[PDB]
Ligand binder design. Structure first.
Ligand SMILES: Cc1cc2nc3c(=O)[nH]c(=O)nc-3n(C[C@H](O)[C@H](O)[C@H](O)COP(=O)(O)OP(=O)(O)OC[C@H]3O[C@@H](n4cnc5c(N)ncnc54)[C@H](O)[C@@H]3O)c2cc1C
Ligand SMILES: Cc1nc2c(=O)[nH]c(=O)nc-2n(C[C@H](O)[C@H](O)[C@H](O)CO)c1C
Ligand code: SF4
Ligand code: NA
Length: 509
C-alpha cells in the first residue's frame, strides 16, 4: 500500500501524488502541525484559511472515495511536524511506499528529502505539474543567460501555453500592453465573501485559542474554503472586475481596498484554483468581447509571467537567496508594521487593511509598505518575515523573490527589475491617501513634510556608489547633483531625524 502525503498548499484532487493511487489500498495523509503553523507567525486569518481549506479538502477526497488519515492541530497525539506525522502514519498503515508532491519552500523540501533515510521506505517525490515550468526547464532557460528578465521568460510561457497566441504571433500584435490613478466608484460591485460554515467556525475558534498573540484579526472571515466557492470567486472576477483590471492596476483608494483585483491568489496558491484554468477563463472572456486586450493580457502576464517566473527564480537562487543584502541594511522592522499605528496615512491604511483582511494588492505591497522599508534601510530578512506572515497568499517561493528582488532590490537586480524607490510625489499621484494625511506630499523639509520625501533622497545618497550606474536612477542622480550643498545636507538631516525616531522606538520594543 501507499502512504500519499498531501501538503496544505496542494489541495487539488489532481495533485501529482494522487496519480496511480489504489483507492481501496492506499491512504492519503493530511496534517495540521505546529511546525508549519509556527515557522513564521502567520496571520490568524491565514492559519484559519489554510486549516479550514485542508479540512474541507479531506472531506472532498473522502467523498471521491479515498481513505484519508487527517490530523487536526488539536489532536492529542499530533506529532508536531510532517516527519513526526509520517512516522505515526507509517506505524499505523505499514506502507511499502510514500508518495508526495514536491513542496514550495526550501525548508519543507529539506524535511521531505530526509524521509527516505529516516524511515527506510521508498519515497517518490513528484514534480508539481501545476506549474508551467519544471525546475529543470527553468534552469535550462536561465543557462548561459547573463541577464534574467521576466519579459523574456513571459514570451516563452505565452508560446508554451498558447494563451493569447495566433499561431506564432501574439494576439493584437504586441506581447505586452504595458499608469493612471482611479476615482472612487460607488457602482463598482463588492467582491464576493463567503460566510463561515460549521467547519470554518470551529477552525476560527481553535486558531484564536491556540494562536491568540499572532498578527491579525479574525473578525469578518470571508475567504472561500471550498473548490466551488473559489470558483465562484473566479466567476465574480471575470464578470465584475476583469474588464477594468488593466485600467486601475497601479491605483490605490482609501475607501476601496480591492479595486479591480481578482483576490484569487489565496486560492491559486493552495490548490483551490488552477493557475492555467484561471488564465483560460480570462482568455475566454476576451474572445466573447467581455474585456479589452490590455486587461486580459495584463492579467495573464501576472500569472504565467510573474508568478511562474518568481517560482523559477526562487529555486534557481538557492536557499541562501534569503541572505541577499545588497545595501548592507541592518535596521529592524518598525513596530508600526505590527500595529498600523503611524501618522503616515498611506502606511496606516495599508497596514490596517493587512491586519483586518490578510490581503493588500500588488502596488500597495510594492509602493507603500515595500517602498517604505526600502527607503528606511530595513534588514531585508525582517521585511521577508513580515510579508511571509501577514498575507493569506504568502509562501516562501512566491513571497521571497517579490521581497528580495522586486521590492527591496536586496539581490542587486538579479531577477531583472529596477529599483522602485519613490517619494510622496508618486503616492500622491497614484492614491488619495495624502488627501487625509497630516503630512504634505509637496514638502520635503519641516514638521509637515511627507517622510517619504527626504527618505527618498537619503536612500539615493547613502547608496550612491552602488546605484549611480543604474539607468532608471540617472535623472534623480542628476537632480541631486544640481542641489546645493546646504539643500543636500538639510534633506539628509531630515531623513536622519526620522530614522532616529525609528531607532529610538525599536530600542524599547
Ligand atoms: C513585497 C511583495 C510581496 C509579495 N508576496 C506575495 C506572496 O506572498 N504571495 C503571492 O501570491 N504574491 C505575492 N506578491 C505578488 C502580488 O502582489 C500578489 O500576487 C497579489 O497582490 C495577489 O492579489 P490578487 O489575487 O488580487 O492579484 P491580481 O492583481 O488579481 O493579479 C492576478 C494574479 O497574478 C498573480 N500575481 C500578480 N502579481 C504577482 C507577482 N508579483 N508575483 C507572483 N504572482 C503574482 C497572482 O496569481 C494573482 O492572483 C508580492 C508582491 C510584493 C511586491
Ligand atoms: C500555516 C500552515 N499550516 C500548515 C499545516 O498545518 N499543514 C500543512 O500541510 N501545511 C501548512 N501550511 C503550508 C506549509 O507550511 C508550507 O508553506 C507549504 O507546504 C509549502 O509548500 C501552512 C502555511
Ligand atoms: S503625505 Fe506622505 S505619508 Fe502622508 S499619505 Fe501621502 S505619501 Fe503617505
Ligand atoms: Na509545489
Amino acid at each position: 500500500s501507499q502512504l500519499v502525503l498531501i501538503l496544505g498548499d496542494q489541495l487539488s484532487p489532481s495533485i501529482a501524488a494522487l496519480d496511480g493511487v489504489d483507492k481501496k489500498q492506499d491512504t492519503i495523509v493530511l496534517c495540521e502541525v505546529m511546525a508549519e503553523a509556527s515557522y513564521v507567525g502567520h496571520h490568524k486569518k491565514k492559519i484559519a484559511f489554510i486549516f479550514s481549506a485542508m479540512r474541507h479538502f479531506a472531506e472532498e477526497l473522502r467523498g471521491e472515495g479515498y481513505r484519508v488519515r487527517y490530523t487536526r492541530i488539536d489532536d492529542a497525539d499530533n506529532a508536531g511536524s510532517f516527519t513526526g506525522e509520517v512516522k505515526r502514519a507509517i506505524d499505523d498503515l505499514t506502507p511499502s511506499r510514500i508518495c508526495v508532491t514536491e513542496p514550495g519552500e526550501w525548508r519543507v523540501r529539506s524535511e521531505m528529502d530526509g524521509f527516505a533515510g529516516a524511515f527506510g521506505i521508498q519515497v517518490d517525490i513528484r514534480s508539481d505539474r501545476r506549474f508551467l515550468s519544471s525546475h529543470g526547464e527553468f534552469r535550462n532557460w536561465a543557462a548561459g543567460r547573463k541577464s534574467l528578465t521576466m519579459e523574456y521568460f513571459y514570451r516563452e510561457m505565452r508560446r508554451k501555453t498558447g494563451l493569447l497566441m495566433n499561431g506564432e504571433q501574439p494576439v493584437g500584435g504586441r506581447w505586452n500592453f504595458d499608469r493612471q490613478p482611479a476615482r472612487p466608484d460607488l457602482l463598482r460591485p463588492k467582491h464576493p465573501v463567503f460566510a463561515p460554515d460549521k467547519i470554518t467556525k470551529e477552525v476560527i475558534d481553535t486558531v484564536e485559542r491556540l494562536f491568540p498573540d499572532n498578527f491579525g484579526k479574525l473578525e469578518n472571515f470571508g475567504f472561500a474554503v471550498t473548490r466551488t466557492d473559489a470558483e465562484r470567486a473566479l466567476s465574480a472576477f471575470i464578470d465584475d472586475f476583469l474588464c477594468n483590471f488593466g485600467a486601475t492596476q497601479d491605483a490605490m483608494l482609501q475607501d476601496d481596498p480591492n479595486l479591480n483585483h481578482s483576490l484569487l491568489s489565496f486560492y491559486i496558491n493552495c490548490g483551490l484554483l488552477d493557475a492555467l484554468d484561471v488564465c483560460k477563463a480570462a482568455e475566454r472572456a476576451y474572445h466573447e468581447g467581455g474585456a479589452p486586450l490590455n486587461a486580459v493580457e495584463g492579467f495573464i502576464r501576472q500569472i504565467i509571467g510573474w508568478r511562474e517566473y518568481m517560482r523559477g527564480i526562487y529555486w534557481l537562487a538557492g536557499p541562501d537567496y534569503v541572505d541577499s543584502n545588497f545595501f548592507e541594511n541592518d535596521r529592524s522592522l518598525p513596530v508600526f508594521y505590527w500595529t498600523g499605528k503611524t501618522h503616515m496615512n498611506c502606511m496606516a491604511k495599508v497596514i490596517t487593511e493587512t491586519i483586518e483582511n490578510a490581503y493588500a494588492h500588488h502596488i500597495q505591497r510594492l509602493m507603500i509598505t515595500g517602498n517604505f522599508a526600502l527607503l528606511a534601510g530595513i534588514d531585508p530578512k525582517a521585511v521577508h518575515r513580515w510579508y511571509l506572515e501577514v498575507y493569506a497568499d504568502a509562501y516562501e517561493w512566491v513571497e521571497l523573490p517579490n521581497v528580495i528582488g522586486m521590492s527591496q532590490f536586496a539581490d542587486g537586480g538579479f531577477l531583472g527589475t529596477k529599483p522602485y524607490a519613490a517619494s510622496g510625489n508618486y503616492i500622491n499621484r497614484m492614491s488619495d491617501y495624502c488627501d487625509t494625511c497630516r503630512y504634505d506630499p509637496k514638502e520635503r523639509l519641516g514638521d509637515n513634510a511627507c517622510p517619504f520625501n527626504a527618505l527618498y533622497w537619503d536612500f539615493l545618497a547613502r547608496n550612491r556608489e552602488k546605484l549611480k550606474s543604474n539607468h532608471r536612477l540617472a535623472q534623480p542622480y542628476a537632480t541631486w547633483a544640481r542641489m546645493s550643498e546646504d539643500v543636500r545636507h538639510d534633506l539628509r538631516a531630515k531623513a536622519a531625524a526620522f530614522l532616529r525616531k525609528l531607532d529610538a522606538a525599536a530600542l524599547e520594543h
